[PDB]
RNA sequence: GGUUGCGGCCAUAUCUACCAGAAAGCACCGUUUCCCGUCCGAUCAACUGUAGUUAAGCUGGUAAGAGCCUGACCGAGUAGUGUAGUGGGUGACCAUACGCGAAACUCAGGUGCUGCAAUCU
RNA sequence: GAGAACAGAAAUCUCCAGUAGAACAAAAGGGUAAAAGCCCCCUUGAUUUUGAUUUUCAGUGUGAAUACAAACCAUGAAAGU
RNA sequence: AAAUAUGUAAGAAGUCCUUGUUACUUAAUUGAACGUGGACAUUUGAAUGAAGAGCUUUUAGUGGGCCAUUUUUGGUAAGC
């Protein structure tokens, strides 16, 4: 009935791992009014630096 | 049976400090937050809209999303054998900036300044911190501080 | 002495606790209209007492608060019913005072043979000029100890006015 | 009371003990959208003392508020208004002065003239196309109670006529009938100029002819009759549009001779 | 330096009780025709700075004051507590070794500081 | 607490003190004083579209909440909500 | 208001200068986010260790547990 013996040893056998951050996190949870404009800003920056 | 509410076992955690009740002072609504700022989570029971859970009280996270009257933060949380990234939407009154970063930022500024000083002056400097080294040789003098002899103290009449 | 120091009258509230609710209540309303000129207001019941027969939220009493020049006129015609003989116990610790008459006809009104017979509660509160600092909204404050009105200053003003011979008992 | 009372007593804020600031109102007037990070949120502060009107434009930082532009009613003698400086028309002219002064400070006084020939209609400062948007200030009427026809909406009307884009509605201006839900512009214009003062002047000229002098003793001594108030306020508004820049009063002393005299009476330790 | 408007930190700012405020400001104050609101122009609204006053508000001093804040050869290296022993004791508990280490108290000191704009002998 | 005809322990009115000792539908805990309490006015955001997130958690469902987006509205002088 | 225990940070995905994008934001040629081009790339900004770091697929057994120190709750008390 919920004996927490051996659970920390089981947790620390295969390590307790960090979530492995990256550059460019996902824009799925951010403000959609900002994300809609950030799409157009990235597109305009790409079209500017393409013909340079 | 046992209960697991949203605010269970939270009697002392979400209560205002002694002689600190009432309205929130206006500095909290004027501190600005950008994406990437590291903030502490410290809820108050006065504003019930946008509270964190009782787990996240005291945890430090990184702002990922700024909108009207509330910021969203990212907190690693250990469940089982690994950490999960929890994204959570807090009002500003449960958020204080972390001053743990604003020693490192000013330290970067200071050592970049003295590194640019030394590399154009013609000397060598260290930029790493060091732990408390052992003490050095000193000659303790005896002019006013003549060593007063101490003795252990007896027990009778002290009782 | 000094201006902004005189115990000017502030308001005189006339009050009648009818105890019941009905035709004498509506009559006493017209009595206070014929006396004051202003329309009066009725008050509800705070609590419930079975032995006095009033329940929660029932209009039982009529009062009207008069100010300005007619307040001391009604005060004079109410004092000449008591023959200008007031007690010392009627004066409160904050310097306001009142009394109660048993017949409401002998003020100077005309008599009606149908509107009922009742007494009336006179109460008058007065203070020196400058008590807007408590009653206003922005920047409230309490009047100073030298400017507060007490029982001794009120009975001194009542002795100087009207040649009262207030009872000190 | 007790030691146990005074140890557990929590005093409120200082400008709440003084009774000067409503923090419940100030939170929502100052607190801004977090996605506009350092954008200042300007408040048109209108305050009424017993013989002066204070119209300031005020932003807010953590180290106290910051005044962008202020305009007082005791500089209206530079434009023509002498008597009745806590007037409805004087509140209008003060709001017009702070609007013209703020737009001259920013550089929008040529693009946003507002309305110049005022008839009392309800009209908001519409944005011009392919240019800058108008300056945006939010009015805050202190601890002052809002009633329809109050003086503090005269400064609102004056700022919106000067072209300061204060968002508002018409249902607190004088002349707004609560039955037809419509305003009377021929009454609002009569309050914008001197109509409700001048009408009382000509009524007291033949109803109580000494109380007329005891009220308008400055008007009779300065030879201002009832009908000239319109001509006073119109040329006053024209002078305000002409030169609204703020030049300070020339000081008698340079604030050290002031301090040397004020330290004499200050009763220090 | 005085004052006003808007403030920041929100008692070193509060509470209690006397005294003083030049100038300017603020305030009390004067009056209901109009906008407005009331049992009541008392609050609120409007008009006049005109008849008056520092009496109050406010500000500043004063107090073996209550509180509040700060500091330590204060309490005290005390209570508590992490680690160790085939330590002691029948036991409750205790001592020792390596560490961390309070609090109420006691004494001393203090009683708002400051930002923006305007104005004043 | 001090006062006022009947009127008192306890009906109505007036002043003074009053950091919440009241009230907030209901358990207990938290919160709240120009309010979140008490009165008054106007209303239907107790609405439409589906997403993201927190809690219990397998990071499944159910329940309940949180912050926005695109509409349409309410209220207020307004910021706002 | 401890002791023990606990979140985060200690840089190259960093810091600074300049000016490009945007339908977002601003009274605004303001800001936000992502950038271009330069500069610092020496101690790449505490200690110690690293016996490689990261990732994926698939599957067995298990899903009756007990004892000791310390804290503790029902319990007169236990090998409760």
Q: From the CB of residue D257, how many other CB atoms can be counted at a distance below 10 Å?
A: 11
3-state secondary structure of C117: coil
Q: Per residue, what are the HEC states of chain D? A: CCHHHHHHCCCCCHHHHCCCCCHHHHHHHHCCCCCCCCCCCEEEEEEECCCCEEEEEEEEECCEEEEEEEEEHHHHHHCCCCCCCCCHHHHHHHHHHHHHHHHHHHCCCCCCCCCCCCCCCCCCCCCCCCCCCCCCEEEECCCCCCCCCCCHHHHHHHHHHHCCCCCCCCCCCCCEECCCCEECHHHHHHHHCCCHHHHHHHHHHHHCCCHHHHHCHHHHHCCCCCCCHHHHHHHHHHHHHHCCCCCCCCCCCCCCHHHHHHCCCCCCC
Rg, chain B, Cα only = 26
Resolution in A: 3.2
Phi and psi for B123 in degrees, rounded to 5?
-125, 180
Buried b (16+ CB within 10 A) or exposed e, D138-153: ebbbbeeeeeebbbbb
Tell whether A31 lies on the interface with B, counting CB pairs under 8 A: yes
Distance CA C43, CA C14 (A): 13
| Contact of B22 with D10, CB cutoff 8 Å | yes
Judged by CB atoms closer than 8 Å, whether chains meet at C137 and D18 is answered as: no
Distance CA D152, CA B84 (A): 56
D145 contact partners, CB below 8 Å, separation of at least 6 = C137
| Contact of C11 with C125, CB cutoff 8 Å | yes
Rg, chain A, Cα only = 22
Instruction: Compute the Cα dihedral for D76, D79, D84, D90 and give only its sign.
Output: negative
Distance CA D85, CA D53 (A): 8
* Pair type for strands C120-126 and C9-17: antiparallel
For residue C160, give the DSSP letter.
H
Q: D67 - beta bridge partners?
A: D58
Run of H or E including A39: helix A32-50
Contacts of D146 in chain C (CB under 8 A): none
Judged by CB atoms closer than 8 Å, whether chains meet at B81 and A25 is answered as: no
Distance CA B146, CA B157 (A): 31
Tokens 């469940």 locate to B79
Q: How far is CA C66 from CA C1, C13, D119, D245, in A?
A: 28, 6, 43, 52
Contacts 24+ apart (CB under 8 A), D231-234: D232/D80, D232/D81, D232/D194, D233/D81, D233/D89, D233/D93, D233/D192, D233/D193, D233/D194, D234/D193
Q: From the CB of residue D1, how many other CB atoms can be counted at a distance below 10 Å?
A: 6
* Pair type for strands D42-48 and D137-140: parallel
Nucleotides of G under 7 A from a protein CB: 6-11, 13-15, 20-36, 40-47, 54-55, 65-67
| B9/F36 CA-to-C1' distance in Å | 23
Distance CA D135, CA D131 (A): 12
Judged by CB atoms closer than 8 Å, whether chains meet at B83 and A16 is answered as: yes
The alpha carbon of residue D250 is apart from the nearest alpha carbon of chain C, in Å, by 32
Reference D59, options B70, B96, B30, B31; nearest CA is B30
Contacts 24+ apart (CB under 8 A), B19-27: B19/D8, B19/D9, B19/D10, B20/D10, B21/B46, B21/D10, B22/B46, B22/D10, B22/D12, B23/D13, B23/D23, B23/D24, B23/D27, B24/B93, B24/D27, B25/D13, B26/D23, B26/D26, B26/D27, B26/D30, B26/D31, B26/D60, B27/D62
Q: Which chain C residues 30-69 have CB under 7 A to strand E? A: 36, 38-41, 63-68
Phi and psi for D62 in degrees, rounded to 5?
-75, -30
Tell whether A49 lies on the interface with B, counting CB pairs under 8 A: no
| D267/E64 CA-to-C1' distance in Å | 24
Nearest residue for F65, CA–C1': B6
- Chains A and C touch, using 3 or more CB pairs below 8 Å: no
Contacts of A30 in chain B (CB under 8 A): 64-65, 72
Distance CA C14, CA C12 (A): 6
**Which residue of chain A comes nearest to B80, CA vs CA?**
A11
3-state secondary structure of C77: helix
Judged by CB atoms closer than 8 Å, whether chains meet at D142 and C139 is answered as: no
Tokens 């969203």 locate to B72
Q: From the CB of residue C155, how many other CB atoms can be counted at a distance below 10 Å?
A: 19
Q: Where does chain B have alpha helices with state H?
A: 104-121
Instruction: Compute the Cα dihedral for A25, A28, A32, A36 and give only its sign.
Output: positive
Distance CA D157, CA D188 (A): 10
Phi and psi for B148 in degrees, rounded to 5?
-85, 125
D79: left (phi over 0), alpha (psi -120 to 50) or beta: alpha
Edge to edge, the sheet with strand B60-67 lists B82-91, B70-79, B60-67, B38-41, B95-97
| Contact of D71 with D101, CB cutoff 8 Å | yes
Find the length of chain B.
Answer: 159
Q: From the CB of residue B92, how many other CB atoms can be counted at a distance below 10 Å?
A: 22
Here the tokens at position D1 are: 């009371």
Tell whether A6 lies on the interface with B, counting CB pairs under 8 A: no
The alpha carbon of residue A52 is apart from the nearest alpha carbon of chain B, in Å, by 30
Q: Which chain D residues 89-148 have CB under 7 A to strand E? A: 89, 142, 144-145, 147-148
Judged by CB atoms closer than 8 Å, whether chains meet at B82 and A25 is answered as: no
Judged by CB atoms closer than 8 Å, whether chains meet at C138 and D145 is answered as: no
Phi and psi for C74 in degrees, rounded to 5?
-65, -35
Burial (CB count <10 Å: 0-12, 13-18, 19+), residue C100: middle
For residue C129, give the DSSP letter.
T
Q: How far is CA D148 from CA D25, D167, D175, in A?
A: 20, 16, 9
For residue C6, give the DSSP letter.
S
Judged by CB atoms closer than 8 Å, whether chains meet at D10 and B23 is answered as: no
Edge to edge, the sheet with strand C97-101 lists C41-43, C61-66, C9-17, C120-126, C97-101
Q: Where does chain C have alpha helices with state H?
A: 23-36, 69-79, 132-135, 151-160
Reference D100, options D239, D232, D240, D236; nearest CA is D240
* Pair type for strands C120-126 and C97-101: antiparallel
Distance CA D141, CA D135 (A): 19
For residue B129, give the DSSP letter.
-
Instruction: Compute the Cα dihedral for C67, C72, C73, C78 and give only its sign.
Output: positive
For residue B92, give the DSSP letter.
G
For residue C135, give the DSSP letter.
H
Reference B41, options B88, B110, B105, B104; nearest CA is B88
Q: From the CB of residue C86, how many other CB atoms can be counted at a distance below 10 Å?
A: 20
Distance CA B112, CA B120 (A): 12
Number of H helices, E strands in chain B: 1, 5
* Pair type for strands D53-61 and D64-72: antiparallel
Geometric angle at alpha carbon C165, from C161 and C166, rounded to 5°? 90
Helices D229-242 and D196-207: crossing angle in degrees, nearest 10, is 150
Burial (CB count <10 Å: 0-12, 13-18, 19+), residue D161: buried
CB-nearest partner of A18 from B65, B80, B83: B83
Cα C147 vs. chain centroid, distance in angstroms? 22
* Chain D: residues touching C (Cβ < 8 Å): 18-20, 142-145
| Contact of B33 with B71, CB cutoff 8 Å | yes
Q: B60 - beta bridge partners?
A: B40
Judged by CB atoms closer than 8 Å, whether chains meet at C137 and D145 is answered as: yes
Instruction: Compute the Cα dihedral for C25, C30, C35, C37 and give only its sign.
Output: positive
Which nucleotide lies at the shortest CA–C1' distance from B34?
G32
Which nucleotide lies at the shortest CA–C1' distance from B125?
G43
| B22/F13 CA-to-C1' distance in Å | 35
| B63/F44 CA-to-C1' distance in Å | 37
Which nucleotide lies at the shortest CA–C1' distance from C38?
E39
**Which residue of chain C comes nearest to D142, CA vs CA?**
C138
| Contact of D248 with D96, CB cutoff 8 Å | no
Distance CA D158, CA D118 (A): 10
Q: How far is CA D124 from CA C14, D148, D172, D176, D262, in A?
A: 52, 18, 15, 17, 48
Judged by CB atoms closer than 8 Å, whether chains meet at D24 and B23 is answered as: yes
Distance CA B64, CA B85 (A): 12
Contacts of D60 in chain B (CB under 8 A): 26, 30
* Proximity of residue D139 CB to strand F below 7 A: yes
Burial (CB count <10 Å: 0-12, 13-18, 19+), residue D10: exposed
Q: How far is CA D129 from CA C20, D115, D134, D154, D166, in A?
A: 72, 17, 11, 28, 19
* Proximity of residue C150 CB to strand F below 7 A: no
| D147/E37 CA-to-C1' distance in Å | 9
| B72/F70 CA-to-C1' distance in Å | 21
* Pair type for strands C9-17 and C61-66: antiparallel
Torsion of CA D101, D106, D108, D110, to 10 degrees: 60
| Contact of C53 with C163, CB cutoff 8 Å | no
Reference D200, options D87, D95, D93; nearest CA is D87
Buried b (16+ CB within 10 A) or exposed e, C9-46: bbebbbbbebeebeebbbbbbebbeebbeeebebeebe
Q: How far is CA D167 from CA B69, C150, D135, in A?
A: 22, 52, 11
* Proximity of residue C158 CB to strand F below 7 A: no
Distance CA D63, CA A1 (A): 58
Burial (CB count <10 Å: 0-12, 13-18, 19+), residue D252: exposed
């Amino acid at each position: 009935n919920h004996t927490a013996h051996n659970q920390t040893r089981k947790a620390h056998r295969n390590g307790i791992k960090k979530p492995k951050t990256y550059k460019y996190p996902s824009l799925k949870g951010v403000d959609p009014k900002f994300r809609r404009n950030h799409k157009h800003a990235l597109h305009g920056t790409a079209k500017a630096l393409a013909a340079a | 049976g046992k209960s697991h509410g949203y605010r269970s076992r939270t009697r002392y955690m979400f209560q205002r400090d002694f002689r600190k009740h009432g309205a929130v002072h206006l500095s909290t609504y004027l501190k600005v937050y950008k994406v990437g700022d590291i903030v502490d989570i410290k809820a108050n029971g006065s504003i019930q809209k946008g509270m964190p859970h009782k787990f996240y009280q005291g945890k430090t996270g990184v702002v990922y999303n700024v909108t009207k009257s509330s910021v969203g933060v990212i907190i690693n949380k250990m469940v089982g054998n690994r950490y999960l990234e929890k994204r959570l939407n807090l009002r500003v009154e449960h958020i204080k900036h972390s001053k743990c970063r604003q020693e490192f930022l000013e330290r970067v500024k200071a050592n970049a300044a003295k590194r640019a000083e030394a590399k154009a002056q013609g000397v060598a400097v260290q930029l790493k911190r060091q732990p408390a080294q052992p003490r050095e040789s000193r000659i303790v003098s005896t002019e006013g501080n003549v060593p007063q002899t101490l003795a252990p103290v007896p027990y009778e009449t002290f009782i | 002495q000094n201006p902004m120091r005189d115990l000017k009258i502030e308001k005189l509230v006339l009050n009648i606790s009818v105890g019941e609710s009905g035709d004498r209540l509506t009559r006493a309303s017209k009595v206070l209209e014929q006396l004051s000129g202003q329309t009066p207001v009725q008050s509800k019941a705070r609590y419930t007492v079975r032995t006095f027969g009033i329940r929660r939220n029932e209009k039982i009493a009529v009062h009207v608060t008069v100010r300005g020049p007619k307040a001391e006129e009604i005060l004079e015609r109410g004092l000449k019913v008591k023959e200008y003989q007031l007690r010392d116990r009627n004066f409160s610790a904050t310097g306001n005072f009142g009394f109660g008459i048993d017949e409401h006809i002998d003020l100077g009104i005309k008599y009606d043979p149908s509107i009922g017979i009742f007494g009336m509660d006179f109460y008058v509160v007065m203070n020196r000029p400058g008590a807007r600092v408590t009653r206003r909204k922005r920047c409230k404050g309490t009047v100073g100890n030298s400017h507060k009105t007490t029982k001794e200053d009120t009975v001194s003003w009542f002795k100087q006015k009207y040649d009262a011979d207030v009872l000190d008992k | 009371k007790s030691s146990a009372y005074s140890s557990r007593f929590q005093t409120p804020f200082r400008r709440r003990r003084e009774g000067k600031t409503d923090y419940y109102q100030r939170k929502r007037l100052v607190t801004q959208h977090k996605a506009k990070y350092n954008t200042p949120k300007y408040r048109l502060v209108v305050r009424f003392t017993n013989k002066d009107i204070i119209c300031q434009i005020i932003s807010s930082t953590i180290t106290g508020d910051v005044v962008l532009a202020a305009a007082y009613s005791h500089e209206l003698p530079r434009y023509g208004i002498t008597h009745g400086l806590t007037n409805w028309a004087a509140a209008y002219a003060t709001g017009l002065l702070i609007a013209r002064r703020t737009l001259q400070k920013l550089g929008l006084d040529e693009t946003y003239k507002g309305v110049e020939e005022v008839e009392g209609e309800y009209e908001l400062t519409e944005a011009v196309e392919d240019g800058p948007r108008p300056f945006k200030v939010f009015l805050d009427i202190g601890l002052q109670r809002t009633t329809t026809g109050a003086r503090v909406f005269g400064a609102l009307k004056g700022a919106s006529d000067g072209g300061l884009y204060v968002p508002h509605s018409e249902n607190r201006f004088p002349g707004w009938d609560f039955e037809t839900e419509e305003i009377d512009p021929e009454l609002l214009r009569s309050y914008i100029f001197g109509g409700h003062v001048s009408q009382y002047m000509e009524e007291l000229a033949d109803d109580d002819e000494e109380r007329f002098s005891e009220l308008f003793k400055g008007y009779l001594a300065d030879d201002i009759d009832a009908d000239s108030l319109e001509d006073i306020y119109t040329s006053a508004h024209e002078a305000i549009r002409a030169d609204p820049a703020f030049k300070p009063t020339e000081k008698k002393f340079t604030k050290e001779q002031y301090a040397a005299e004020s330290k004499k009476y200050r009763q220090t330790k």
